[PDB]
Chains A and B, each alone.
With several copies, the nearest count.
Chain A
Amino acid sequence: RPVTSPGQHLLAPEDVVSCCLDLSVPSISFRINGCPVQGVFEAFNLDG
């Protein structure tokens, strides 16, 4: 599913992906090179 970020590009060298997981919501969020990723996973199963 396409997601909008500043300077969209397929993962390249000198790129940092920050992954955040909040189990309360639940939600998974991303930031690319310090820039927000305009998309989130949420409402997923917590069976493990």
Chain B
Amino acid sequence: GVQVETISPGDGRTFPKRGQTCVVHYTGMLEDGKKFDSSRDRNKPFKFMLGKQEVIRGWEEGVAQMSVGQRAKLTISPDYAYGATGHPGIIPPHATLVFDVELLKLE
């Protein structure tokens, strides 16, 4: 399950569409609060296309609900996330994921 809570509002009209590239800044934490990823440390926005399946199910659906300029917290269950096998070294098995995502623009 994807669970979205607005940290800061966006425009409220412009929402991602399939085949539309989404540009985000994100910070990733496990449910316990440990951080495993952040685009800001790399100082480079992360770009992904919708419906393509580059990113996990949770990102797809959650960013689908967001708006341009919107900042949100996304809680993703393992089944939408990497799940039982996990991401070796980075993410343990059966890990709920917390993400802080700012949807900068659509291109």
Contacts and interface: CB of A to CB of B under 8 A. Distances in A.
What range describes how many residues of A lie at the interface? under 10
Interface in B1-33: 5-9
B27 to A, nearest CB: 14
A15 to B, nearest CB: 12
Contacts of A7: 9
Interface string A1-21: 010000111101000000000
Nearest to A9: B8
12 contacts: A2-B5, A7-B9, A8-B5, A8-B6, A9-B6, A9-B7, A9-B8, A9-B9, A10-B7, A10-B8, A10-B71, A12-B8
Top 3 A-B pairs ranked by shortest CB distance? A10-B7, A9-B8, A10-B8
